[PDB]
């Protein structure tokens, strides 16, 4: 019995969920469902990251309050995640009372502990709109090639990089007014003070090898103080005792993990679990599933923030690579930039969950969704290997034996081979070696289908006096199916439900030790149908048209 708190990165509230995000939530959900199957106390937590200048400016363009826009995006996001059956125990928001109080608390403790410094800096300022401008909101003519209408610190024409201050005839993307340098006091988090603490953390062998290596690069470059304040106008949390100053979104974002859990506890009327999970001497486990582009925040700023505020640190960080479609970054022009909602119009959630899982590993490598291979893998593995085991045998049981399975296993040894694999497959799920688990499961499926081929029930069915043998053979195939679906339960939630309805039994990890004997099963409509390239073409075409 373990206590585990698992999170996925908090998606920004200024964009729709796409297949890239889904890889992250699907990987976490499979791990979480497996942990639940092994009987642990699990708390799967997430929320929308709703602060920041971009969000503030978007709402303004749309002519609505940031609170209205984020509210709409929060519902959109949760609807999509629900469509893919991501089993969160709570989905909250960084813009909440819980996060506000927790953000103020942590800040106050850090300051109290001498980890916050004051410093004045110079930055481009929009005198017309009356707001400091982040680089991406400063446009002008490239100093090098002189190309007009360039944004940020780089020219999309000659590719040169430079400070926005170097842009010729600068202009605010907000008002179009000419920007100017202006001073401002900022608050900094003294990350450098936790250097040794962080280095030991990196060196423990807990973090993924590739992540540890990455961190060594950052220590080499040298840690610096982190600017965690932003001036009004800004959509975020105001800094105590600092009128007109707000916490930079990345400061309150990870605290959102804590805010979402506190929210869950308070809603449950649970007054002891928050401290049991976050206090320094906690015996519970904390895990964050994140993409490799936000590792700096989670491996350096985050642990240091918790340490300096007297809270426990993450047990581990689980980093994943990026999703590519047909081998390349999603392309809007090619119709490979696919939204989660769009996907569900063409395929079911189980298909993508399975494809991603078959390709996932414990490393940070990229995951490629090759659409052609997708159709082939789904049809060959789900339809032809696993579901086939049920469909080719259920008919005889229902029509010839009134849905009743044999009183004994026809091949006890073969069944033992299947149950004997639970240890290694469970370890594969546990260690996040999803690709390994799937290969082992499909290897078993091949064995099961070979067994059925060897017995040839379609032949036995037409031989008089072989009734008892037919029931024995078909019952055996169905029990092998029972075991396989148990191993795949964390992966295919819906197919699993349809499987449990047919089998008249909930599938539990330990349950496979007791095969279904003299047991009534129910007839069933198609458990899973084949898909085809025409559907893929439709998906791509729709995606092209949507942008
Ligand atoms: C306290 S965590 C705050 C995270 C921040 N709001 C953020 O970052 N939001 S995000 O919406 O841009 O990204 C959410 C997660 O999606 C992941 N991905 C975004 N695009 C992706 C792919 N194309 N492929 C794989 N993961 C992707 C990111 O790495 C990130 O972990
Ligand atoms: Zn240029």
Outline of this structure?
By secondary structure, this protein is an alpha/beta fold. It has helices spanning 19-37, 53-62, 66-83, 97-112, 195-202, 209-221, 249-252, 255-268, 273-278, 295-308, 340-346, 349-359, 371-400, 412-420, 422-430, 434-455, 457-460, 467-488, 493-503, 533-546; strands at 3-8, 41-48, 90-93, 116-126, 131-132, 138-141, 150-151, 168-172, 180-189, 226-227, 229-231, 245-247, 285-291, 316-320, 323-325, 367-369. The radius of gyration is 28 Å and the shape is elongated.
List the helices and strands and how they pair.
Blueprint: E1 3-8, H1 19-37, E2 41-48, H2 53-62, H3 66-83, E3 90-93, H4 97-112, E4 116-126, E5 131-132, E6 138-141, E7 150-151, E8 168-172, E9 180-189, H5 195-202, H6 209-221, E10 226-227, E11 229-231, E12 245-247, H7 249-252, H8 255-268, H9 273-278, E13 285-291, H10 295-308, E14 316-320, E15 323-325, H11 340-346, H12 349-359, E16 367-369, H13 371-400, H14 412-420, H15 422-430, H16 434-455, H17 457-460, H18 467-488, H19 493-503, H20 533-546
Helix pairs in contact: 2-3, 4-8, 11-20, 13-16, 13-18, 15-16, 16-18
Bound molecules: 5'-O-[(L-methionyl)-sulphamoyl]adenosine and zinc ion (ZN).
Zinc ion binds next to loops.
Cofactor: Zn(2+)
Keywords: Aminoacyl-tRNA synthetase, ATP-binding, Cytoplasm, Ligase, Metal-binding, Nucleotide-binding, Protein biosynthesis, RNA-binding, tRNA-binding, Zinc
Catalytic activity: tRNA(Met) + L-methionine + ATP = L-methionyl-tRNA(Met) + AMP + diphosphate
């Amino acid at each position: 019995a373990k206590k585990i708190l698992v999170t996925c990165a908090l998606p920004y509230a200024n964009g729709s969920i796409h297949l890239g995000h889904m890889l992250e939530h699907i990987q976490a959900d499979v791990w979480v469902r497996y942990q639940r199957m092994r009987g642990h106390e699990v708390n799967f937590i997430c929320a929308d990251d709703a602060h920041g200048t971009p969000i503030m400016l978007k709402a303004q363009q749309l002519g609505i309050t940031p609170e209205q826009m984020i509210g709409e995006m929060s519902q959109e996001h949760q609807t999509d995640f629900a469509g893919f059956n991501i089993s969160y125990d709570n989905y909250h928001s960084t813009h909440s009372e819980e996060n506000r109080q927790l953000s103020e608390l942590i800040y106050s403790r850090l300051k109290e502990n001498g980890f916050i410094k004051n410093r004045t800096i110079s930055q481009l300022y929009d005198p017309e709109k009356g707001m400091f401008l982040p680089d991406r909101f400063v446009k002008g003519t490239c100093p090098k090639c002189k190309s007009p209408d360039q944004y940020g610190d780089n020219c999309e024409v000659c590719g040169a990089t430079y400070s926005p201050t170097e842009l010729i005839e600068p202009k605010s993307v907000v008002s179009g007014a000419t920007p100017v340098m202006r001073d401002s006091e900022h608050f900094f988090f003294d990350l450098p003070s936790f250097s040794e603490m962080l280095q030991a953390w990196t060196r423990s062998g807990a973090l993924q090898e590739q992540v540890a290596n990455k961190m060594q690069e950052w220590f080499e470059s040298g840690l610096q103080q982190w600017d965690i304040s932003r001036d009004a106008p800004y959509f975020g949390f105001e800094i105590p005792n600092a009128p007109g100053k707000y916490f930079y979104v990345w400061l309150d974002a990870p605290i959102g993990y804590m805010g979402s859990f506190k929210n869950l506890c308070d809603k449950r009327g649970d007054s002891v679990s928050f401290d049991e999970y976050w206090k320094k001497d906690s015996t519970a486990e904390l895990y964050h599933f994140i993409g490799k582009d936000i590792v700096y925040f989670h491996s350096l700023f985050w642990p240091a923030m918790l340490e300096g505020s007297n809270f426990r640190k993450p047990s581990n960080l689980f980093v994943h690579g990026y999703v590519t479609v047909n081998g390349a970054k999603m392309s809007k022009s090619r119709g490979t930039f696919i939204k989660a909602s769009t996907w569900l119009n063409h395929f079911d959630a189980d298909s993508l969950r399975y494809y991603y899982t078959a390709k996932l590993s414990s490393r940070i490598d990229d995951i490629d969704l090759n659409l052609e291979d997708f159709v082939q893998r789904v049809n060959a593995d789900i339809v032809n290997k696993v579901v086939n085991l049920a469909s080719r045998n259920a008919g005889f049981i229902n029509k010839r034996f009134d849905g009743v399975l044999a009183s004994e296993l026809a091949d006890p040894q073969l069944y033992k081979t299947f149950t004997d694999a639970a240890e290694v497959i469970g370890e594969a799920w546990e260690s996040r070696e999803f690709g390994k688990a799937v290969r082992e499961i499909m290897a078993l499926a091949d064995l099961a289908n070979r067994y059925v081929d060897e017995q040839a029930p379609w032949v036995v069915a037409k031989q008089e006096g072989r009734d008892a043998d037919l029931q024995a053979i078909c019952s055996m195939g169905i029990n092998l199916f029972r075991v396989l679906m148990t191993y795949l339960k964390p992966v295919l939630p819906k197919l699993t439900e349809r499987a449990e309805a047919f089998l008249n039994t909930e599938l539990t990890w330990d349950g496979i030790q007791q095969p279904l004997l003299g047991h009534k099963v129910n007839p069933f409509k198609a458990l899973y149908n084949r898909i085809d390239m025409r559907q893929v073409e439709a998906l791509v075409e729709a995606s092209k048209e949507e942008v």
